[PDB]
Amino acid sequence: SPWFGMDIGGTLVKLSYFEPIDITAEEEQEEVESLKSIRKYLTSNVAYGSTGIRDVHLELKDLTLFGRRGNLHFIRFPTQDLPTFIQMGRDKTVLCATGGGAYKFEKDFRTIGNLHLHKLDELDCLVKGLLYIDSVSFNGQAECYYFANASEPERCQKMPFNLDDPYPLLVVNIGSGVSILAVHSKDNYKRVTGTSLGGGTFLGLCSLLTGCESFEEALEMASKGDSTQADKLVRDIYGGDYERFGLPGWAVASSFGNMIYKEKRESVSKEDLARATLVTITNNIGSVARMCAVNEKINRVVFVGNFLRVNTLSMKLLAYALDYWSKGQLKALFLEHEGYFGAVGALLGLPNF
Amino acid sequence: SPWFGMDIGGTLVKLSYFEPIDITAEEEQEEVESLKSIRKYLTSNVAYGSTGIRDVHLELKDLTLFGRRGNLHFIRFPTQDLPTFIQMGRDKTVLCATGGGAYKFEKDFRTIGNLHLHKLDELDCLVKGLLYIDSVSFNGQAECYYFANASEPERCQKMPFNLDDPYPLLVVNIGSGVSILAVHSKDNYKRVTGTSLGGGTFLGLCSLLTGCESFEEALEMASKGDSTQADKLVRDIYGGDYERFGLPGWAVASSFGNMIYKEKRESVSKEDLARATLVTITNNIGSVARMCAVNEKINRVVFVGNFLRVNTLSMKLLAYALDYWSKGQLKALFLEHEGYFGAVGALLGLPNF
Numbered sequence: 224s225p226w227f228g229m230d231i232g233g234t235l236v237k238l239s240y241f242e243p244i245d246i247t248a249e250e251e252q253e254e255v256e257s258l259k260s261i262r263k264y265l266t267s268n269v270a271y272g273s274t275g276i277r278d279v280h281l282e283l284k285d286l287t288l289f290g291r292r293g294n295l296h297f298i299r300f301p302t303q304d305l306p307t308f309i310q311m312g313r314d315k316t317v318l319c320a321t322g323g324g325a326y327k328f329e330k331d332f333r334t335i336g337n338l339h340l341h342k343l344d345e346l347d348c349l350v351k352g353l354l355y356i357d358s359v360s361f362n363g364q365a366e367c368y369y370f371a372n373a374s375e376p377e378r379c380q381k382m383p384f385n386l387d388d389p390y391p392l393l394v395v396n397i398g399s400g401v402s403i404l405a406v407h408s409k410d411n412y413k414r415v416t417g418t419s420l421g422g423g424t425f426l427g428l429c430s431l432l433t434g435c436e437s438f439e440e441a442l443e444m445a446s447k448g449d450s451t452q453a454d455k456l457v458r459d460i461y462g463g464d465y466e467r468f469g470l471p472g473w474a475v476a477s478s479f480g481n482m483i484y485k486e487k488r489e490s491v492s493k494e495d496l497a498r499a500t501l502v503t504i505t506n507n508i509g510s511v512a513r514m515c516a517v518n519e520k521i522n523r524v525v526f527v528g529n530f531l532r533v534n535t536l537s538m539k540l541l542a543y544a545l546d547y548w549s550k551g552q553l554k555a556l557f558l559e560h561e562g563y564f565g566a567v568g569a570l571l572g573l574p575n576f
Numbered sequence: 577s578p579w580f581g582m583d584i585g586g587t588l589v590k591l592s593y594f595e596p597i598d599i600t601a602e603e604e605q606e607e608v609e610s611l612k613s614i615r616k617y618l619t620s621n622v623a624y625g626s627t628g629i630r631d632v633h634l635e636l637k638d639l640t641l642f643g644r645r646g647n648l649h650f651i652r653f654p655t656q657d658l659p660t661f662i663q664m665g666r667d668k669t670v671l672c673a674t675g676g677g678a679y680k681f682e683k684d685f686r687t688i689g690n691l692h693l694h695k696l697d698e699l700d701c702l703v704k705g706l707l708y709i710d711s712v713s714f715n716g717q718a719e720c721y722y723f724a725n726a727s728e729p730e731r732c733q734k735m736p737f738n739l740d741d742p743y744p745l746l747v748v749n750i751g752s753g754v755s756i757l758a759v760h761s762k763d764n765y766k767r768v769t770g771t772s773l774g775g776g777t778f779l780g781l782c783s784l785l786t787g788c789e790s791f792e793e794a795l796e797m798a799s800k801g802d803s804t805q806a807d808k809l810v811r812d813i814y815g816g817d818y819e820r821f822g823l824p825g826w827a828v829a830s831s832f833g834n835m836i837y838k839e840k841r842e843s844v845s846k847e848d849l850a851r852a853t854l855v856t857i858t859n860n861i862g863s864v865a866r867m868c869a870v871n872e873k874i875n876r877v878v879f880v881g882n883f884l885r886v887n888t889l890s891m892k893l894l895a896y897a898l899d900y901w902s903k904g905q906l907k908a909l910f911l912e913h914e915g916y917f918g919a920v921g922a923l924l925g926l927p928n929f
């Protein structure tokens with residue numbers, strides 16, 4: 224049976240697949256053609272149907288797992304298209320699955336005869352997956368990185384970051400919504416809180432406000448926008464800084480607060496609204512992460528989940544905001560395999576079955 | 577000179593006016609007609625021009641202030657119309673002013689000749705005003721109230737609440753944005769944090785999403801809406817509860833998260849979107865207030881500012897959410913003179929000048 228781990232989220236399904244590369248002569252002859260065809264289909268294509276994507280740049284090559292050498296592949300598709308994936312699965316296997324859809328779609332996976340579904344917790348898998356990928360490294364490079372001198376744009380640059388002793392750690396999982404975890408040891412972690420203002424809020428509001436049809440298009444619009452056209456800033460209320468409580472004139476006082484004026488609503492652009500949505504969501508996540516960090520006494524905050532994939536705007540905004548508002552006490556950290564840790568952690572549960 | 581205190585906010589100007597009622601015979605003869613006409617205009621009208629409103633139901637009658645008996649009046653109008661107010665002021669006085677507009681519009685107030693402007697801090701005035709109004713009571717009734725048994729709708733009802741020893745206290749000021757204060761004594765308080773997701777976000781987003789033309793109309797739309805048409809709930813992701821971390825199926829997992837689907841965007845109503853906006857803003861304020869309370873070790877959280885005026889939906893939502901998510905550890909408290917404490921606190925600064 225092929226070695227998959229699957230994280231079925233509210234929005235995206237994430238799949239980790241281990242391709243063995245030490246297949247012996249006897250093994251190659253003694254494998255059933257369906258097993259052969261699966262491996263071939265997955266490794267010879269980078270688009271699967273109309274919505275599956277293999278993130279080739281994330282592949283972990285020559286990894287030793289369960290005593291075999293192979294390549295770890297990372298694949299994603301919309302949860303909306305899971306029926307299609309399951310239908311392909313019934314054409315002519317132990318599936319470790321996590322995320323909410325491991326429960327919601329349990330009965331659907333069992334339409335695949337003789338398939339054994341083992342459900343694993345969405346956040347145990349996250350923790351296990353994150354610690355594992357960082358421990359094996361990203362093909363010899365750091366899995367973890369930050370933005371050095373994030374306060375200064377002429378200096379701000381991605382730099383690797385070492386997590387050899389990775390405790391304690393605040394993990395901020397930005398999916399559809401947000402889960403915040405305090406990780407004290409490999410076996411000791413709790414969900415501190417969460418927020419419902421997450422990746423799905425950005426995409427949903429953006430679609431309502433601008434008609435964008437994709438996450439990527441929403442980000443493209445936002446990169447061309449000016450969020451201060453929609454937001455009311457401290458200087459719009461004070462005429463400058465609010466010096467007494469150290470609030471700079473440029474801080475947002477009211478997100479979308481300038482949209483209470485009909486004349487401003489009529490002159491704001493879709494790009495402006497896309498950017499204000501991104502900035503509003505991103506700043507609220509950073510602020511919540513900051514309050515949790517201070518309360519949990521944790522100064523390393525790592526952001527994961529697919530809201531940040533191909534999203535340097537939000538990453539730089541988080542790097543700069545966390546550092547500025549914490550007066551340099553907290554560090555914003557990021558991971559190359561952003562959205563896949565649950566899928567990896569599920570795959571790692573395989574020996575338990 | 578008449579006794580005013582003024583809080584010029586990003587959205588609303590709030591004005592407290594003390595009408596003396598012990599005017600003696602000699603005093604009545606020795607008052608200039610302009611002073612007479614001001615007092616008459618203010619006490620014989622409840623609408624001032626097209627946008628000024630006197631909140632008659634909030635009046636404090638037979639109050640002793642600065643050694644005189646009088647009535648304390650509460651008046652509001654949009655900051656957008658302050659030029660009109662200032663123009664009336666130049667037709668044929670010491671003004672204690674707070675809020676951001678005391679700085680932004682300082683030079684405008686000085687176009688009123690021989691007028692002395694004394695700027696006071698937006699949050700010192702809040703604290704002083706709140707403690708004062710509660711101490712003199714609301715014409716003998718409690719200024720402070722909560723919703724008893726807010727978890728149970730057949731039981732949930734407004735009940736008075738005593739603040740005779742009002743420390744410590746978490747004050748959540750929901751204006752355009754949100755300021756959160758930890759009040760340890762009459763003289764010892766700090767701004768813990770704030771959020772830019774406040775009253776202006778509700779009104780701005782609502783106007784963009786539904787075309788509503790007033791705060792009151794936005795609330796009317798929201799009262800008829802179903803926020804779960806726009807929001808993705810825990811049960812939409814899991815198929816029910818997320819039992820492992822105590823998240824009920826009905827909790828919002830992603831605000832507006834169902835709006836990523838074109839078919840749902842096409843079937844959602846304006847009322848649904850108004851309600852989802854209110855619920856999104858209100859829950860985020862409550863969650864932030866909860867994290868600050870836990871971090872500051874304060875279990876009484878009082879919500880003020882005009883986002884909650886004529887807004888029982890948000891109040892009940894805050895009462896229920898704070899109690900549910902804090903497992904009953906925190907109490908949501910409300911004050912009858914919600915938006916006026918800064919204006920009162922400014923008026924109380926009068927002897928200092």
Ligand SMILES: Nc1ncnc2c1ncn2[C@@H]1O[C@H](COP(=O)(O)OP(=O)(O)NP(=O)(O)O)[C@@H](O)[C@H]1O
Binds near residue numbers: 422
């Ligand atoms: N191709 C894409 N399609 C949709 N959303 C995308 C895409 N790329 C990035 N995103 C963003 O990533 C978010 C989903 O991140 P992800 O970590 O996969 O969440 P999830 O696991 O599906 N949801 P959850 O059930 O809350 O854990 C979306 O809300 C978008 O903001």
Ligand SMILES: Nc1ncnc2c1ncn2[C@@H]1O[C@H](COP(=O)(O)OP(=O)(O)NP(=O)(O)O)[C@@H](O)[C@H]1O
Binds near residue numbers: 791
């Ligand atoms: N008649 C109204 N007009 C406008 N907004 C109203 C009205 N009634 C209630 N509101 C709400 O009350 C909010 C303003 O509350 P308020 O406490 O007066 O803020 P502010 O002092 O003007 N702003 P700030 O500079 O941040 O302190 C608005 O954002 C609306 O959500």
Ligand SMILES: CC(C)c1ccc(NC(=O)N2C=CN(c3ccc(C#N)nn3)CC2)cc1
Binds near residue numbers: 470509541544548770
């Ligand atoms: C006084 C009133 C006009 C007002 C109300 C609200 C604000 N606004 C704030 O008070 N904010 C505080 C913290 N902010 C962030 C942003 C990112 C991160 C991270 N990471 N942390 N905090 C948001 C803005 C100002 C004036």
Ligand SMILES: CC(C)c1ccc(NC(=O)N2C=CN(c3ccc(C#N)nn3)CC2)cc1
Binds near residue numbers: 859899
């Ligand atoms: C697991 C994933 C699908 C997910 C992500 C986010 C959520 N959502 C939450 O985790 N929330 C936590 C606290 N909530 C509130 C609300 C009001 C108050 C007050 N007062 N406090 N907290 C918001 C929702 C669920 C699943």
Ligand SMILES: [Cl-]
Binds near residue numbers: 340341342
């Ligand atoms: Cl199982």
Ligand SMILES: [Cl-]
Binds near residue numbers: 693694695
């Ligand atoms: Cl002054």
Ligand SMILES: [Mg+2]
Binds near residue numbers: 233322398399565
């Ligand atoms: Mg997820």
Ligand SMILES: [Mg+2]
Binds near residue numbers: 585675
């Ligand atoms: Mg105010």
